[PDB]
PDB file of C-alpha atoms in Angstrom:
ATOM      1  CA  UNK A   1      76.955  90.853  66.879  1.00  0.00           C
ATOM      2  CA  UNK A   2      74.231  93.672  67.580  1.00  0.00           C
ATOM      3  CA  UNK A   3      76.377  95.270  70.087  1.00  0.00           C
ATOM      4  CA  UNK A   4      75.425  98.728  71.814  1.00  0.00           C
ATOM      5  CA  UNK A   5      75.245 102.168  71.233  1.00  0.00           C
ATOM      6  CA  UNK A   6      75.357 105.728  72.559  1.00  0.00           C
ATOM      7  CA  UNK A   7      76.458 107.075  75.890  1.00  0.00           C
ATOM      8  CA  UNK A   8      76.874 110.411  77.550  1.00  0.00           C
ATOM      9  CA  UNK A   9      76.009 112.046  80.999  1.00  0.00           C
ATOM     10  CA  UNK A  10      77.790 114.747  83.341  1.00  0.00           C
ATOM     11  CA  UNK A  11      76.815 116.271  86.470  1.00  0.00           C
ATOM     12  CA  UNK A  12      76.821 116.696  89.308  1.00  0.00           C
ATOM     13  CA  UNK A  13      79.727 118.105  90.535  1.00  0.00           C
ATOM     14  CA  UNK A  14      82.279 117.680  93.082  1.00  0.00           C
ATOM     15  CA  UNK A  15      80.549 118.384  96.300  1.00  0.00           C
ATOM     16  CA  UNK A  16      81.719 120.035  99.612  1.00  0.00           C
ATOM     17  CA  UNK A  17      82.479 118.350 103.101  1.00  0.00           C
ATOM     18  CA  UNK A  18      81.437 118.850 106.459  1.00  0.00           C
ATOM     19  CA  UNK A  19      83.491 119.541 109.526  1.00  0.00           C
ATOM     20  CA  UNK A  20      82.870 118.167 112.787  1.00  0.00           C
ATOM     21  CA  UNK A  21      83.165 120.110 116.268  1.00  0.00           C
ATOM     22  CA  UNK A  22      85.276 119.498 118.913  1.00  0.00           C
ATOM     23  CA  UNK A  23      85.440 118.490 122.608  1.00  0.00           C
ATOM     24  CA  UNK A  24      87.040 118.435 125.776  1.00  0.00           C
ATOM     25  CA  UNK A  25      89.469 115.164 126.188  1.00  0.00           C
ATOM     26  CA  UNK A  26      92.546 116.964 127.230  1.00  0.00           C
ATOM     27  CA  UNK A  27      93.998 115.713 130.020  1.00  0.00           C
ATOM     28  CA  UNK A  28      96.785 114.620 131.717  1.00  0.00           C
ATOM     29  CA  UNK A  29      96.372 113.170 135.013  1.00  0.00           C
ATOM     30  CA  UNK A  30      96.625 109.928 136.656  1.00  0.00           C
ATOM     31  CA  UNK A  31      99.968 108.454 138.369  1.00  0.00           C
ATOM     32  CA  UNK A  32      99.515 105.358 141.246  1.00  0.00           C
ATOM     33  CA  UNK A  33     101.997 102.820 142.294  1.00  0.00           C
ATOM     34  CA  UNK A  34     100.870  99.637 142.403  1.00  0.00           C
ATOM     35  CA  UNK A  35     102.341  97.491 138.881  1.00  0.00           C
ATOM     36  CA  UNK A  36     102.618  98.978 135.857  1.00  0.00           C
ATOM     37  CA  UNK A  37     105.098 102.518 136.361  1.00  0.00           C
ATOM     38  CA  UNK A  38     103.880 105.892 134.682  1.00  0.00           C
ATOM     39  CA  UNK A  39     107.465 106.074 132.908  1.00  0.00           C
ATOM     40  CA  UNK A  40     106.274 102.972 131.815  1.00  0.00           C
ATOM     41  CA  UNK A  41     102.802 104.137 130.661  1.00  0.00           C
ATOM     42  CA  UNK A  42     105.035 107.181 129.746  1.00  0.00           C
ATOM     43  CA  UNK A  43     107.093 106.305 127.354  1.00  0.00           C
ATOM     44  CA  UNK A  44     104.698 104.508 125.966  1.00  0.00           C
ATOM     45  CA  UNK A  45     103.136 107.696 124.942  1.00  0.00           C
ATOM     46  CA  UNK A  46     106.157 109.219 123.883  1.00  0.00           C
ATOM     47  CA  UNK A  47     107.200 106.359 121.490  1.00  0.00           C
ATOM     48  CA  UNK A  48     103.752 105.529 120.468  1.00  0.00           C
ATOM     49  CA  UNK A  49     103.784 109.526 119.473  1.00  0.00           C
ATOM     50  CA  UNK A  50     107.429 110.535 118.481  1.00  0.00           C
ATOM     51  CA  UNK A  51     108.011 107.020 116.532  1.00  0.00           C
ATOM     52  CA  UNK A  52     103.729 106.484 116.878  1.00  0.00           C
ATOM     53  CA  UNK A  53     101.695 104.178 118.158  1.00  0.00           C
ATOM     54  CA  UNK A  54     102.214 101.339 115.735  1.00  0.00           C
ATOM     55  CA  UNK A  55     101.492  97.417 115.915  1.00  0.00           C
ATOM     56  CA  UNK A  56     105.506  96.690 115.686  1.00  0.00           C
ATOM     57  CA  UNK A  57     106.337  99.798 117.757  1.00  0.00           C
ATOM     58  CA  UNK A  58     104.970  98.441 121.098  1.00  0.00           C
ATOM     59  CA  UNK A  59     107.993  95.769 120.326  1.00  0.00           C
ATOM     60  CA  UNK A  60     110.516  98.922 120.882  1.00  0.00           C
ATOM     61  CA  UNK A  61     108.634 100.077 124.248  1.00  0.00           C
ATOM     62  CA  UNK A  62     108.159  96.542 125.450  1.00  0.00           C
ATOM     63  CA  UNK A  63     111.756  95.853 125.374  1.00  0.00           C
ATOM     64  CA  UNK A  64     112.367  99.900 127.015  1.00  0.00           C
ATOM     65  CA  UNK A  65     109.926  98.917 130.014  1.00  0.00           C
ATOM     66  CA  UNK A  66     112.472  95.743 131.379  1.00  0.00           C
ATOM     67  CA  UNK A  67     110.910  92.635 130.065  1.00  0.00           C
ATOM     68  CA  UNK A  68     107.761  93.844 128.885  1.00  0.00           C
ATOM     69  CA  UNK A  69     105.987  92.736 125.943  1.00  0.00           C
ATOM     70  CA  UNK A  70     104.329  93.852 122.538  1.00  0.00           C
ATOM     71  CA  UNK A  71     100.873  92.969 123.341  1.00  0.00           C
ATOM     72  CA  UNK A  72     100.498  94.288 126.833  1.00  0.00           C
ATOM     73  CA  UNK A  73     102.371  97.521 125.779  1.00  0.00           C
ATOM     74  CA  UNK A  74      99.150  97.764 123.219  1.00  0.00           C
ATOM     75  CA  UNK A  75      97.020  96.568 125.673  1.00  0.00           C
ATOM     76  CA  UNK A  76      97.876  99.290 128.207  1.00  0.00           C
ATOM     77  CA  UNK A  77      98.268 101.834 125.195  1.00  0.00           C
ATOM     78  CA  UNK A  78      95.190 101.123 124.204  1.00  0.00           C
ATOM     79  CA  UNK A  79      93.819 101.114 127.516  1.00  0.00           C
ATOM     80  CA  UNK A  80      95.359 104.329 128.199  1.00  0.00           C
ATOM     81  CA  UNK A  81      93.097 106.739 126.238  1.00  0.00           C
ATOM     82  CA  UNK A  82      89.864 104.227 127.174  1.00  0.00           C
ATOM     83  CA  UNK A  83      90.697 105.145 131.097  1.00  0.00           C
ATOM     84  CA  UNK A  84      91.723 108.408 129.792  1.00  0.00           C
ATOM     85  CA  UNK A  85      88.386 109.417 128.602  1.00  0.00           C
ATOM     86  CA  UNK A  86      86.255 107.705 131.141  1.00  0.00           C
ATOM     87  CA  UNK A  87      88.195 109.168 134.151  1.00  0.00           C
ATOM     88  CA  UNK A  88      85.048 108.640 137.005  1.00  0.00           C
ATOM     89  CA  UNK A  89      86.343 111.292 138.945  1.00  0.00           C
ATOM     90  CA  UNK A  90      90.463 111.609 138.547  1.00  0.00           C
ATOM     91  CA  UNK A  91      91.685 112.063 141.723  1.00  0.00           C
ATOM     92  CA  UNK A  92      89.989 110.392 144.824  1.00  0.00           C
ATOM     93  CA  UNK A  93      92.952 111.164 147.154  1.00  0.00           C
ATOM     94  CA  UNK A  94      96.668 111.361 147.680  1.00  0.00           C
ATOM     95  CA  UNK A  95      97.154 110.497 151.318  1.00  0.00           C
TER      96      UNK A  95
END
């Protein structure tokens, strides 16, 4: 066979990265009776941070709730940071 030949090249090289800025999000407000308990939405927190919020973790929480499940501990979880962040005014009234 003819086969090939030659080959060589360098450059560039290794490149820097960019860091992105930060904003507000802190916040920890909310508590109203009504279904789901803020222990409830609590510990969820707590678990999904000290043992984090993983798939098979909400099957730990689910079970520490009462007779909770897996995919509504995600689904409040997950729901969590959405309300979180969109707030609409947190705090209309106590009375």
């Amino acid at each position: 066979g003819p086969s090939g030949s030659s080959g060589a090249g360098a450059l560039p090289k290794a490149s820097e990265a960019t860091v992105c800025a930060n904003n507000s999000k802190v916040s920890s407000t909310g508590e109203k009776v009504v279904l789901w308990t803020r222990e409830a939405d609590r510990v969820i927190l707590t678990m999904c941070q000290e043992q984090g919020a993983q798939p098979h973790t909400f099957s730990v929480i689910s079970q520490q709730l009462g007779n909770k499940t897996p995919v509504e501990v995600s689904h409040r979880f997950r729901e969590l940071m959405q309300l979180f962040h969109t707030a609409c005014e947190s705090g209309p009234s106590s009375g």
